[PDB]
Structure 1
Amino acid sequence: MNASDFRRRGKEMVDYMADYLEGIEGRQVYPDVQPGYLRPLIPATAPQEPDTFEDILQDVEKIIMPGVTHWHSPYFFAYFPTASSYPAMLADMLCGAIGCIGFSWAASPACTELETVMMDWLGKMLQLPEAFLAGEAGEGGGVIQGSASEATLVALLAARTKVVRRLQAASPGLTQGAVLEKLVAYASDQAHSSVERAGLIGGVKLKAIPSDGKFAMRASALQEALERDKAAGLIPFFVVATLGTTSCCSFDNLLEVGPICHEEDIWLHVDAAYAGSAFICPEFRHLLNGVEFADSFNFNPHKWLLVNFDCSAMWVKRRTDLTGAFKSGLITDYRHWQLPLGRRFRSLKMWFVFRMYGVKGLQAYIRKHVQLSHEFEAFVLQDPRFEVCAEVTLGLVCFRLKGSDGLNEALLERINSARKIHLVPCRLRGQFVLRFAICSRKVESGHVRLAWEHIRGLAAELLA
């Protein structure tokens, strides 16, 4: 079709989007569709002749929607939030229209330059040390990665390469294969699975560092592991410290870990995928104290900062430390900052979001969510039948019906079968725990109260 048709159709799509989001509260959050349901509802072959937009759009309602899990219903309380905001959407539309591939500066200077500048804005909102800012003459800078799992993998590969170079440039005969055999990487036992994948791909060993009572990685445990391993002939080289674990949203001790990785000369990567967004708020910024020591810091604006998915923010103090694994001031070659060669004009989304919401708007959004999270915690704290399993700092609450894991597995089964709200569990020291996460952009105190009541009702029934 041509421009004229797109004005028509494109505008129809906008109303569709608005309708879907406007009425999302009337959607059943989790689907009843069975695995493999879709293939039989669709032809076996692409059509030879065109189909009608109208026809395709109703297929969306009648066939696709039944297999959709609505992350944006205020009743979606699973995992962590995924971002979705009108400003990013508008931006995404533009990005697609300009349709450039920023694999090189010449392919579109702006695709590259807006990114560096936006990463600096965000860097400043987080109050990161100047060492991470590109500016006009800093050895550091930031880049948009596809996801936190990729950011982590990129850091590990940069670390791996850096340690192999140092070792070979000090031991002539030395082969890389030799160095890999003894390379060890560490992460909290609460670390995300993206770390294992990273070690797996990078071809190195990964060890877990037992966490403390507050589920945090401490200097003590880390040091022990290091000594134990150096003494065994191994070579520590990478450590991922997590800020806002996926289990209970706890925080590794950065002021204790940073100094250790520094003195031991270990690449320290900080994965704050979820909690990172909160650091633009003074109240929480302390949680990030210690970045000073990090070689690379990452968090997902596509989780809790309203920038629609496909937007993870990563910073490093020495651009060449990163650039070297795939080979000041202005950056022109992002292709040495990530795994793939191509990339979209993703920074448009950050720009539209940061500009259309403003810093204050963003801070409010986060606080409202943390407020809602504490309201839920209160409910649980008020009912003697339940218990709150971990300190509640941000938008996640881990609760439990006082009793056995069997009793709790049961409550969960009854909650999901009821199809009103959607929750996910996790194990916290082997114990079965239920997670309550504030997600949707449009969640209100009302949704939480109703959600709690519904859970309390089911627990009661189950208890009789």
Structure 2
Amino acid sequence: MNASEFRRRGKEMVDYVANYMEGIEGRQVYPDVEPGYLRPLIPAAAPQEPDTFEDIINDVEKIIMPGVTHWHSPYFFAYFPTASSYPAMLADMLCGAIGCIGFSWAASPACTELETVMMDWLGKMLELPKAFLNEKAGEGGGVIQGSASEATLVALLAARTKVIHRLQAASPELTQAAIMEKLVAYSSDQAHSSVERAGLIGGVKLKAIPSDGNFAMRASALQEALERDKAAGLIPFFMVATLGTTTCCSFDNLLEVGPICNKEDIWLHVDAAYAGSAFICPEFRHLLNGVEFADSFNFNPHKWLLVNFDCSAMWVKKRTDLRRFRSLKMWFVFRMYGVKGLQAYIRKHVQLSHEFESLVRQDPRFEICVEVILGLVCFRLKGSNKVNEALLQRINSAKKIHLVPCHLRDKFVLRFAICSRTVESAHVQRAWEHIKELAADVLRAERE
């Protein structure tokens, strides 16, 4: 295809995408296909001659869409939101023409330059401590990573390299491997699986810190674990504190664990992949207090700040401890929405979260398990885990809305996450009515 035909087909695809988005409430949010559905519907080999664009788009509607989970449907309340905004989409189109690979500054200067400025824009929007900013010859700075999982891995490897060099300087008699089997990393028992993944990749031990009644990491639990592990010969070197846990959106207490990590010379990485976006609002910035103690901080604009994946924003206090023109998406989103537009987006989602919480709190058959702070509500029917497993199965099997659960200690808990860019109060109210009706069916069945 040449540019003249792209002029036609590109505008046709713009209309197709806009049509899909405008009619997305008519789509069943979760598909009815079963594993392996697609292979019988597609030829076994690539075509030798070209297919037509019309044939391909027809296949998207007929055989791709039936297997799509519509993350941007207003009735998608699962996991955490995925960012999709038209400003980011417009930037991605330009990236296909002027993006490259960005491994060096000379690969394309604009790519590296814009990223440095955009991370300063975002760092100032979050009112981050100035030690994290690229700006005004600060020793710190930010980079865009592909994912929070990658950012956590990068922080662990930087911490691993630093502690090996430190221990070898103190005792030149030590090899890297002898240090390796004594290193231990820490995280909450509510930490995302990416922490364990990073520990396995890095080849170090990982231990979970028991959380308190609010599922937060506290000084007393951390000090108890350090006392045990240091006596056993382990060397704490890395810590992932989480602001906005994937299970219940709880917050580790940075004001308590930060000073401890600094004292112990433990690299403190703050994983705020979801919750970090809300810290651009002054009423939520207090949830980030204590980040001044962290050695690295990370959150995903590609969850809840409307910058289409991939865009994971990581700041490090000292850059010396440490691609797709992904900063173009950030630039577009920040400029076409403005800081106030992004703040209104965050606040609407949090308002809608409290609206669902209000409905659950009106039904004494249910209970709220964790304090509602951002766009997540953790709730369950009072009683057995099995009645709640039945409720979740009935919900996801009806495929009108989509939820995922979690385990809080031994308790099976349902999650309600505000996700879609276009979700409204009516969608939240309808979802609750659906959940309430199915709960009556499930409660009926348990007593009969």
1:123 corresponds in structure 2 to: 123
**Once the 2 structures are TM-superposed, how far is the Cα of residue 173 of structure 1 from its aligned partner?**
1.9
Other structure's SS at 2:46 match:
coil
**Once the 2 structures are TM-superposed, how far is the Cα of residue 430 of structure 1 from its aligned partner?**
1.3
Q: Which residue identity lines up with residue 77 of structure 2 in the other structure?
A: F
Q: Which residue identity lines up with residue 359 of structure 1 in the other structure?
A: V
1:191 corresponds in structure 2 to: 191
Q: Which residue identity lines up with residue 305 of structure 2 in the other structure?
A: L
Q: Which of 409, 412, 419 is equivalent to 1:429? A: 409
Q: Which residue identity lines up with residue 189 of structure 1 in the other structure?
A: D
Distance 2:51 2:247 in 1: 46
Distance 2:70 2:431 in 1: 16
Distance 1:141 1:253 in 2: 24
2:168 corresponds in structure 1 to: 168
Distance 2:170 2:388 in 1: 57
1:439 corresponds in structure 2 to: 419
2:330 corresponds in structure 1 to: 350
Other structure's SS at 1:240 match:
strand
Distance 1:151 1:315 in 2: 9
Distance 1:66 1:207 in 2: 42
2:225 corresponds in structure 1 to: 225
1:337-363 per-residue CA deviation (whole Å, 9 max, x = no partner) reads: xxxxxx211100000000000000000
Q: Which runs of 5+ in 1 are unaligned?
A: 323-342
Cα root mean square deviation, aligned: 0.7
Q: Which residue identity lines up with residue 314 of structure 1 in the other structure?
A: M
Matches within 5 A, 1:82-121: 82-121=82-121
Distance 1:321 1:220 in 2: 30
Distance 1:170 1:463 in 2: 64
Distance 1:400 1:458 in 2: 13
**Once the 2 structures are TM-superposed, how far is the Cα of residue 321 of structure 1 from its aligned partner?**
1.1
Distance 2:217 2:99 in 1: 44
Q: Which residue identity lines up with residue 299 of structure 1 in the other structure?
A: F
Q: Which residue identity lines up with residue 333 of structure 2 in the other structure?
A: V
1:372 equivalent to 2:372? Answer no
**Once the 2 structures are TM-superposed, how far is the Cα of residue 458 of structure 1 from its aligned partner?**
1.2
Q: Which residue identity lines up with residue 172 of structure 1 in the other structure?
A: P
**Once the 2 structures are TM-superposed, how far is the Cα of residue 98 of structure 1 from its aligned partner?**
1.1
1:8 corresponds in structure 2 to: 8
1:179 corresponds in structure 2 to: 179
Distance 2:93 2:103 in 1: 20
Other structure's SS at 1:382 match:
coil
TM-score, normalization by structure 1: 0.95
What is the percentage of aligned positions where both structures have the same residue?
89
1:154 corresponds in structure 2 to: 154
1:388 corresponds in structure 2 to: 368
2:256 corresponds in structure 1 to: 256
Q: Is the 8 A contact 2:99 2:111 kept in 1?
A: no
Q: Which residue identity lines up with residue 80 of structure 1 in the other structure?
A: F
Distance 2:129 2:311 in 1: 22
**Once the 2 structures are TM-superposed, how far is the Cα of residue 460 of structure 1 from its aligned partner?**
1.5
**Once the 2 structures are TM-superposed, how far is the Cα of residue 248 of structure 1 from its aligned partner?**
0.6
Distance 1:39 1:147 in 2: 30
Q: Which of 427, 438, 448 is equivalent to 2:428? A: 448
Q: Which of 374, 383, 401 is equivalent to 2:381? A: 401
**Once the 2 structures are TM-superposed, how far is the Cα of residue 121 of structure 1 from its aligned partner?**
0.2
**Once the 2 structures are TM-superposed, how far is the Cα of residue 169 of structure 1 from its aligned partner?**
1.5
Q: Is the 8 A contact 2:273 2:303 kept in 1?
A: yes
Where does structure 1 differ by over 3 angstroms across 4 or more consecutive aligned residues?
A: none
Distance 1:259 1:250 in 2: 20
Q: Which residue identity lines up with residue 397 of structure 1 in the other structure?
A: V
1:398-445 per-residue CA deviation (whole Å, 9 max, x = no partner) reads: 111112111111111111111110111111111111110000000000
1:25 corresponds in structure 2 to: 25
1:360 corresponds in structure 2 to: 340
**Once the 2 structures are TM-superposed, how far is the Cα of residue 461 of structure 1 from its aligned partner?**
2.4
Q: Which residue identity lines up with residue 61 of structure 2 in the other structure?
A: E
1:139 corresponds in structure 2 to: 139
Matches within 5 A, 1:56-95: 56-95=56-95
TM-score, normalization by structure 2: 0.98
Distance 2:136 2:433 in 1: 55
Distance 1:219 1:173 in 2: 34
Q: Which residue identity lines up with residue 247 of structure 1 in the other structure?
A: T
